[PDB]
Amino acid sequence: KFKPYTPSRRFMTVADFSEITKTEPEKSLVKPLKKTGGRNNQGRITVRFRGGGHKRLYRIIDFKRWDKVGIPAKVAAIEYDPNRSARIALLHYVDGEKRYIIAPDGLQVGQQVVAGPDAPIQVGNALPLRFIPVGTVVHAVELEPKKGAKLARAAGTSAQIQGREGDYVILRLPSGELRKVHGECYATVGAVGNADHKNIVLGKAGRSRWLGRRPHVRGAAMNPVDHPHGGGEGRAPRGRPPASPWGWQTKGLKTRKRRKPSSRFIIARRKK
Amino acid sequence: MKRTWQPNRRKRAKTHGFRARMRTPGGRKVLKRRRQKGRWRLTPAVRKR
RNA sequence: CCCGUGGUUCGUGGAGCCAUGGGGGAAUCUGGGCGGACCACCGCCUAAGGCUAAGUACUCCGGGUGACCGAUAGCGCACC
RNA sequence: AGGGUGAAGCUGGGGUGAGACCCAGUGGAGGCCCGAACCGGUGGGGGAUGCAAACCCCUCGGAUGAGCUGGGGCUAGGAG
RNA sequence: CAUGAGUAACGAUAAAGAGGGUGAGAAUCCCUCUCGCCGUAAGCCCAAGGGUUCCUACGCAAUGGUCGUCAGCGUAGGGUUAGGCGGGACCUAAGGUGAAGCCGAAAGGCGUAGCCGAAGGGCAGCCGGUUAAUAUUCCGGCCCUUCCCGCAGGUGCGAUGGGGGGACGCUCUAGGCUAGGGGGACCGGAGCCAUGGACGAGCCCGGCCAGAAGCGCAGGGUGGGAGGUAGGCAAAUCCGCCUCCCAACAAGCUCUGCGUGGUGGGGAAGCCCGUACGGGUGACAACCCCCCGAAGCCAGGGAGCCAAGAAAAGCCUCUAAGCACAACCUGCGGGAACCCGUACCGCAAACCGACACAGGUGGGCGGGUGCAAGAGCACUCAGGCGCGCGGGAGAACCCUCGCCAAGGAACUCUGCAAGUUGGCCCCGUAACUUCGGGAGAAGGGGUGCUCCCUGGGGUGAUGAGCCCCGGGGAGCCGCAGUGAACAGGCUCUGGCGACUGUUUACCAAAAACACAGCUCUCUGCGAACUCGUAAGAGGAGGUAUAGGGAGCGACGCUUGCCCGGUGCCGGAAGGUCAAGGGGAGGGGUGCAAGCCCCGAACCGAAGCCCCGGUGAACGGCGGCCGUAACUAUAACGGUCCUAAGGUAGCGAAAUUCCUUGUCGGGUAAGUUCCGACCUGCACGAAAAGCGUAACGACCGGAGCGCUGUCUCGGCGAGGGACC
Ligand SMILES: NC[C@@H]1O[C@H](O[C@H]2[C@@H](O)[C@H](O[C@@H]3[C@@H](O)[C@H](N)C[C@H](N)[C@H]3O[C@H]3O[C@H](CN)[C@@H](O)[C@H](O)[C@H]3N)O[C@@H]2CO)[C@H](N)[C@@H](O)[C@@H]1O
């Protein structure tokens, strides 16, 4: 029920460089799931470019485990949703009920794993940080206990356990930074399920992108009647500005944001 | 040649009606205004069927 | 009483009194704002609750009068 | 409407260790290719108080996709 | 109220001519007879929307673009009725409302819940007959629907709260049934040879449609238990988790074919009569046989592929609590069932454009022949017409369309146009290439129809039952054999751009913008922005492979020189200043304690200065002078200047004015383009630079082909012009 990434159509005219992926569980989801409105327009004013749609399923997923902190679960199997950067495992809880959950590193259908008060540090179970075997990996992870799985490292194979101090453990998050969460808080054990996805290649843009749902963006689009920047000519403007009365693209946003100093440091950057 | 007309028993009837006018304050207001300021009636009455 | 503002014949000013948005932050008739930014005087009024009549306004509607109009002026509109 | 194209998987036959990979059959995917209904509307032509407040003709592009379309709705006018 | 004007014009070049009729008058009404155009629509059909009108009877002064005894016109009267069609008496999404709640100077903003709110859900009938007129609504035959009263048999019955459940892409697609095509000389029938012929498997007409369920084709939708039954999906045997047996092409329970009760219809002619709307009409039928079949139906299939496809009845399943003695499941009898709806127009003179405007406007085969296939083609079936002003000769000339020869672009800014050319089958097919392809490259050749020998996929084996090519052979007639209508002109080459596209409604088919894919860079989620007066939503039930700002824009090679100024990014040591904290001190009044100013030593926020950082960040990347045996530049030869001073590729280009630059090619000649050169008036990598196959209604340069296009064209047909 894993999934092929690479399959690429071939020379079926410019449908060139189209990357397929196929989770093998292929089953159509199950019983627990509604749908999302057609947002893009919202609070009934309209906003943010692109946006279009394309077919309609729509998710409900588990984001909180302490709610059975124990009932082993066995991979119902693999599958996913018209959302999320890295598929899911519909899991079965030994008590009858099941739940759509993450999809850490390639686990295995039928596999038992669970979590709570002491779970075996086997990628799959989840645990209050504290049970953090420092130097290990998780994601999903949530600071401010109860505030549900906060930091759903999307396909975000990224929760790197980095030491502890006080009632907070240190973590290396996607981004390339290290924040802190009080141990009692929690983490889904292990890592994500998708990345190659991230590399996926798609053919005739219009076709693909739109299918994605998203349409466009078109800067200093000539007639700068608005389009912040210049136009009514070839030449790329100067000032150094962006759409809807913008600050270019090299300035802050944070602030006192009591948030900030409160934890984390590394400051915002990487260097591949 | 989509000369924009082509009404809809529904749509038009719909969009506009006594109710509706009384709903929006502007609706109501204009209502009375016209109504007794100069007689007539109310197209939101104009309706058919 | 400090600044941030409204009133008022006051548009920033030596600019007073009433009035309030911020922070300060009390006096029972030796009480306390008010005449003169302000200080010494005399004087003035009695504040931070309540009630209403009567004299000017208005014209739907009625009556009446017109060096006010005659059907393209008069209400556009003298009559389904 | 209709027609051609002819990938991927697979099945078998072919060559190493198995394998690559080949060939053949199957297949019959979106791009699509051809071309009506459908949707656009240059290229030339035909009206100037024209069938018409944007047309008729000969013609031409897409002809499963960011496609076309009836019904039901929300955003609107210094806003969309 | 005049004026061109009694000229321009009548709404489509889909033609009409006759006879009789009725009339005050009939090109322009009625019948009937000749005749053309639709037919894939000028068909019918549902729906929308119109809302009169529809009919029947009188009438025409207004109205139709004149007519007019015609009407959709005027006057009057009559005309659509349904437990089972539809919609509500039910369900719900988006979506509006909104008891709560959060929120505004006010008016409101936001809003769960419950509600309103759909040809999206769900639900019980069909066919034959009858009116001037309406119909599965009426009549009749046939088949049911729930709800109420009862009774008869049967049960833990008994919410709508838990659950299971109805529920869902797209592409495609096996198997199975009517629709629905089609030949039956196959049976019924009213007739015929007119004309050289044939009365002969001749023509012409028809040879069904509905039918409880009973039943026979297809399939169409799965598990029995038991127990544990640490979830339950709060409350309990119903689901789901674990386990041991039976888990059978299993019995299961939901549409077709026959049924057949059985009813009903049943057409040609034909000729009798009404205007017609019509009717008798032959027994009145014969109503059987064989062929082809779908995107329809069974069916929620079945495979494959992602971009991975809605919420309320029904079956159960327990409280409430009744039930359980009168609750539910189930037969028979009895009795009930209301509200709003049809007329007709209705791809259009009745719906939308102010007109009987040739514009537009949603789904239902779309009869037949032929064509490889087919809603395109040409002629037609039914069914629909004949556009509503006529007759007339027919000259100018615009229109529409036809033919040419001699030459075949010289016309011309442009081969604008138009002609060439085009239907399938076989021979065959270039530089280049992302080896997908450019190929319908390109260039040939073919087909018609006869008779003859020869193989095939159909259908109950398979034998008058059909579709595929056969294959080949001899031969037949035309200038001619996709014989008419559907139907590529082509090749070479260059700039741009990738290619699919959207737009510019009103010129601007097409670059621009898309874009896939590049890089910078922004944000830690109560992200960052976007609207908002809070409230709040949005964002994202997403959660830095993620969500934003951006210049570019497949891909290939490749992105170099400066951050001294600008913005942005980093550090406040220091200089620097608002309010403030503030007190030195001066000050007016104070006989006086005192009351009150001014007040400024010092502390004091970002910012600003300052110091680094900094281009896929604004934005820029030079000037001059000298030297190698001689005659020509090239190397630094040091200097003036600044931040350095433009690399790689690139060049007279969608940037060279001197320019029709100079050479070269093309050419009788060419400022045109291709190639060179390169002293680049004023290219350069990121608003990309050089290149780069495929793809363009791209724009430009060749050349073969063809053609009243050009040397003038010349006659010709159809329409106005003209009487
Ligand atoms: N290594 C240098 C190589 O040669 C050139 O260098 C260039 C550059 O460096 C240098 O530029 C310098 C700059 O001071 C400024 N532009 C003024 C100065 N006159 C100039 O120098 C010039 O004049 C010099 C004295 N008369 C001579 O050495 C020579 O002619 C020339 N270099 O001069 C060269 C030409 O402008 C190429 N540009 C480069 O690509 C290549 O690598």
Curated annotation (Swiss-Prot), chain A:
It comes from the Bacteria. InterPro entries: NA-bd_OB-fold (IPR012340), Rib_uL2_dom2 (IPR014722), Ribosomal_uL2 (IPR002171), Ribosomal_uL2_bac/org-type (IPR005880), Ribosomal_uL2_C (IPR022669), Ribosomal_uL2_CS (IPR022671), Ribosomal_uL2_dom3 (IPR014726), Ribosomal_uL2_RNA-bd_dom (IPR022666). One of its GO terms (biological process) is cytoplasmic translation. One of its GO terms (molecular function) is rRNA binding. GO terms for cellular component: large ribosomal subunit. Keywords: Ribonucleoprotein, Ribosomal protein, RNA-binding, rRNA-binding. The keyword Ribonucleoprotein applies. Residues 253-272 have a biased composition (Basic residues). Residues 226-236 have a biased composition (Basic and acidic residues). The keyword Ribosomal protein applies. Residues 219-272 are annotated as: Disordered. One of the primary rRNA binding proteins. Required for association of the 30S and 50S subunits to form the 70S ribosome, for tRNA binding and peptide bond formation. It has been suggested to have peptidyltransferase activity; this is somewhat controversial. Makes several contacts with the 16S rRNA in the 70S ribosome. PANTHER family: LARGE RIBOSOMAL SUBUNIT PROTEIN UL2M, RIBOSOMAL PROTEIN L2. Part of the 50S ribosomal subunit. Forms a bridge to the 30S subunit in the 70S ribosome. Belongs to the universal ribosomal protein uL2 family. This is Large ribosomal subunit protein uL2.
Curated annotation (Swiss-Prot), chain B:
Keywords: Ribonucleoprotein, Ribosomal protein. Residues 26-49 are annotated as: Disordered. Pfam families: Ribosomal_L34. One of its GO terms (biological process) is translation. One of its GO terms (molecular function) is structural constituent of ribosome. Residues 29-49 have a biased composition (Basic residues). GO terms for cellular component: ribonucleoprotein complex; ribosome. The keyword DNA-binding does not apply. Belongs to the bacterial ribosomal protein bL34 family. The open reading frame (ORF) for this protein is entirely within the ORF for the RNase P protein (RnaP). The two start codons are separated by four nucleotides. Part of the 50S ribosomal subunit. Found on the solvent side of the large subunit. This is Large ribosomal subunit protein bL34. It comes from Thermus thermophilus (strain ATCC 27634 / DSM 579 / HB8).
